[PDB]
Amino acid sequence: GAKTWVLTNAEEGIDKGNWQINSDQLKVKDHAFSIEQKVLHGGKQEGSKILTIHSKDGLTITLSPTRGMNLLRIEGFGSRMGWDSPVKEVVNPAFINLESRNGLGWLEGFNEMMVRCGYEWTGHPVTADGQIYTLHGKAGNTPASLVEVEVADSAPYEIRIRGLVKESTFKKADLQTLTELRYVPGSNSFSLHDVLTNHADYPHDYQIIYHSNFGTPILEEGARFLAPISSISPFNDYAKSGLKTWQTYQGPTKDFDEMVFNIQPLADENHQTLAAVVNKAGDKGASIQFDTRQLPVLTLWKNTDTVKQGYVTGIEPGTSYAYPVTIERKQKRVKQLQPGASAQFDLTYTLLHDSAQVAAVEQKIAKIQGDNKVAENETPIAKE
Amino acid sequence: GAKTWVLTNAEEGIDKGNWQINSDQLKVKDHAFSIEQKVLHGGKQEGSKILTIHSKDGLTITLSPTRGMNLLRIEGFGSRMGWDSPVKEVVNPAFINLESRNGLGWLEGFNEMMVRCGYEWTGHPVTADGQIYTLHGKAGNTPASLVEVEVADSAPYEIRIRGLVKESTFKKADLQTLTELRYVPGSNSFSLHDVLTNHADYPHDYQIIYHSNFGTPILEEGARFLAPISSISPFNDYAKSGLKTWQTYQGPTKDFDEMVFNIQPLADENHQTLAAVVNKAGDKGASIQFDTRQLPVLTLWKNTDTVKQGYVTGIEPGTSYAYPVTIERKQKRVKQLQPGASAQFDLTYTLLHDSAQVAAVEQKIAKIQGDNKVAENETPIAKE
Amino acid sequence: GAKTWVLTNAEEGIDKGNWQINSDQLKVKDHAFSIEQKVLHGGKQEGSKILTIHSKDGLTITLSPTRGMNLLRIEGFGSRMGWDSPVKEVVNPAFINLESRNGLGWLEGFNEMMVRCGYEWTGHPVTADGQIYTLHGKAGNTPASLVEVEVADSAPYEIRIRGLVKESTFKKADLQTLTELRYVPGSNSFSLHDVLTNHADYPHDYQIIYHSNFGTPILEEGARFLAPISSISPFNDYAKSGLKTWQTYQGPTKDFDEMVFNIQPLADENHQTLAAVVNKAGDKGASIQFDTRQLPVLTLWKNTDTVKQGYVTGIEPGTSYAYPVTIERKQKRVKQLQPGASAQFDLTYTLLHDSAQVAAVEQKIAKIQGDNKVAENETPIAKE
Numbered sequence A, B, C: 001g002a003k004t005w006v007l008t009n010a011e012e013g014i015d016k017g018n019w020q021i022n023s024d025q026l027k028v029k030d031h032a033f034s035i036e037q038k039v040l041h042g043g044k045q046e047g048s049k050i051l052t053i054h055s056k057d058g059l060t061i062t063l064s065p066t067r068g069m070n071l072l073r074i075e076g077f078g079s080r081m082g083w084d085s086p087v088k089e090v091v092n093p094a095f096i097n098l099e100s101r102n103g104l105g106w107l108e109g110f111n112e113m114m115v116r117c118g119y120e121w122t123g124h125p126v127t128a129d130g131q132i133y134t135l136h137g138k139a140g141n142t143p144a145s146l147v148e149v150e151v152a153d154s155a156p157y158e159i160r161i162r163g164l165v166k167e168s169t170f171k172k173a174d175l176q177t178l179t180e181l182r183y184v185p186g187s188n189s190f191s192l193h194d195v196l197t198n199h200a201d202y203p204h205d206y207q208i209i210y211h212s213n214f215g216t217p218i219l220e221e222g223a224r225f226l227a228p229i230s231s232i233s234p235f236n237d238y239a240k241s242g243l244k245t246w247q248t249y250q251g252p253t254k255d256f257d258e259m260v261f262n263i264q265p266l267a268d269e270n271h272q273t274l275a276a277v278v279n280k281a282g283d284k285g286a287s288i289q290f291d292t293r294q295l296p297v298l299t300l301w302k303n304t305d306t307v308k309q310g311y312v313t314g315i316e317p318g319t320s321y322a323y324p325v326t327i328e329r330k331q332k333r334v335k336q337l338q339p340g341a342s343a344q345f346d347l348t349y350t351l352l353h354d355s356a357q358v359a360a361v362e363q364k365i366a367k368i369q370g371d372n373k374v375a376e377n378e379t380p381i382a383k384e
Ligand SMILES: [Cl-]
Pocket: A004, A005, A006, A007
């Protein structure tokens, strides 16, 4: 079957803190691994936890239960999924005021490979309904209430890490997400299987962007963005000049800031699509597979500014674009979950570590693109 | 005589954390009990403390020193005082931003049987001056600075639990409340004897509502609210339809939200009054005794919505109604405390667990009411 | 040689918590001392740290690594640098919302002898752009990321305490200050040698006020403020009446609140200046040496209100006056720090404990003032 360890359970008032298991204790001499929770200290990181899967000749996956089960970084195969933010600390949400800087205090903690920007709302901040809707919602700055590590009894010893992140407020909402990361030791991919449940007796809105962020050694001058798309448009007027070269990345560029593109992806016959970033040579990359019934739109964030400012790209499948909640409501992208109902989010991330792997991804994308022409539309779909 | 244990003393920088005493080890020979402080973990409850008096044959009383000595739950005699909020965690105030949601962040922590909504201000939020007065003030989200447990050395072994909750701000205020709960082991009642003191050299405003909340098994369709009153009026236009049936509760009702009523209570010759919620059969209930010189007004919060949304009633004696501080100042209910002066708050809460007990409460209330007519006034006293 | 202890290093995820060293363990000859870090508990002080140098027959210096290495108090020679705020706790910044009270939340934590009011911004609050610039910035409410204690192994055994306080925000800033206090056992002075560094690739504004605060036994009726100045002016209309007796303090006075004065100091042949507060008899005082190229302006805060409200004076060298950032920008005092560049802050604090030490400071100040006339300007330089 499987062994489960409950690391954190708020209903029983318990948290194991520092903890580790390893493949020697389970008596398995195949692809060695360990799973470890560490309580961090110093600065604004005081009391933050990280949980890591260390796989011999596979991926090392670091996530933070304190920060909504956000993925900090993925390393392996001479590469990584991650970037180098000026924010070096794993910031305890107790030291972040999301309302500060007119709804941009979230920037004080942003350094992750994957942040769930949701679920009660998402996107750029706005003052509306008499309140501040803060940048990218609350999931990424909510400590998990339940954290469980499961390891399969039988080969290939799949690891599942679940974390329940709650957005429970009297008179407002009771949205809770059971996040799950799955990883087979030695594999070059992992998957997320997240389930958002509306525990209230009333329907409630939700939004989510799987904000996935990649820097060197995949991002570089001449790196490319690959996706099957029916249309692409600039987020704002500043991005218009980058529309023609949407598929190619510049090297680290002073005064660039960012250019964002809103994409309507194409999917295969079973609603699966794939997006990727690959290096100039075409021998390193990262791909994200997602289901367009769950996540119908895609944001491309090209943050090719200096290495210290942040040299990174975001491939961001979502229910929404990053416009503020007022625009996402007006344009009918905000979703609704019936009382007691659940929404699933299935994503597969692959660290592409040779030319053949990049070629296969590029071939699949071409097959989905087929003879459909990419419509490059210069007019932004909204103005904030 | 009595023995005192000092669980928390910020002046000496100490906090015992996990701690317990019990009647066995104390060689107490009559009603068995234990008193336990527990440090909680998980989710937004990380570091939060609860302090519980466990009784074999009496009341089990849980309070939270992290959350201003608010009373979380009272259980005994086949019943309870409390309710089931969507907020299941004992939220550490470090994870609440009271200014968020336009001064409604307090909703993210609300699950208690008794919240002190005060003392520097209280009531619904409003932006006045250039500042946000947040929902129900700060006492309830302030960790106690001094916590002591006292047990009398001989029968009946009265237990007292004291907690100093400070609202100290340079240039603004130095209001401090020494909260105190008293419980005789085996009893069906407990009392509060709080003392607010103005430690500043200037008079300062204060407001307080003892926001006392009762759900199932007391609250149900056909449950009744009992009180001796001179007048009652709806809080807003929406409550006008419920005024004629103010004394009777509906079952859990979808789309109800809440109806609030503002009451001017009658008192006996010693300025004591009594209010209660009783079930339909009249064999379970809870009564609150309060002093109308200390708490001159009463708010009835009828939140008979769905069980998941909140099926609960508040019996809320206060110096103020729940309108914002702007309305409470305008209508002259904001009290002032002179330099060095103190204000006392004496309340007795009784868990009524048979017909005779409910009948006795109903008879005392009928005696205080006497021949005074209840004025049901249709016009709200203020508009927010 | 020298011995170093790393008490806190966020990069490695470590913090020593409770820790001590003493001069018996280090085999020191003629002067006994200890350095101790203590983790505090209770109220809003839970988890806050203090770090103290105890020197027998010298100064006892207490600072807080949790609160940006702010100096809490200095004690020795029958006197002290410090004051008695109504805020008695060492408030963990997790429990302060700087945006509360319209940007005055900082007031809930203010009790320190020296607060670094900076560095991203400083001064009184203002809502500009779209954003709240909160009172006196963020350094004083930021836990240190790296904390090091260094002690020289031979006479006179100088102690150095370094604390890295970061203001790192994606897309906004990456200002980091390596604070440093130096102290020689047995001495009546200590020094600060801080270094602010812009770790970003873009120039950034900065401001700093070294908010140094003194009460009894130095401050009293007829206490004097000494400084070599070219001009002094009041902060606002209310401070006009105190302009002529700027050098003289009143006793604790009801309804005074405060009077603030904006000074232009003179300096010596190496750009050094000296400001001091001395008692009426002139046998106790405190002086601050600073570099006028580093901190070109000086603020005198006379808060001679009651002992309970706050009987304190601030000698406040800085790059800016306490006006909001809008005024400081407009009147051209906001400094710019270039990419990779550093700014230094060298200050010497001396606890004056006899008539001749006060004599010397007043005569050293005498030499600096010379034949230059003090221009008392009745017009405030700005209106907030
Ligand atoms: Cl377990």
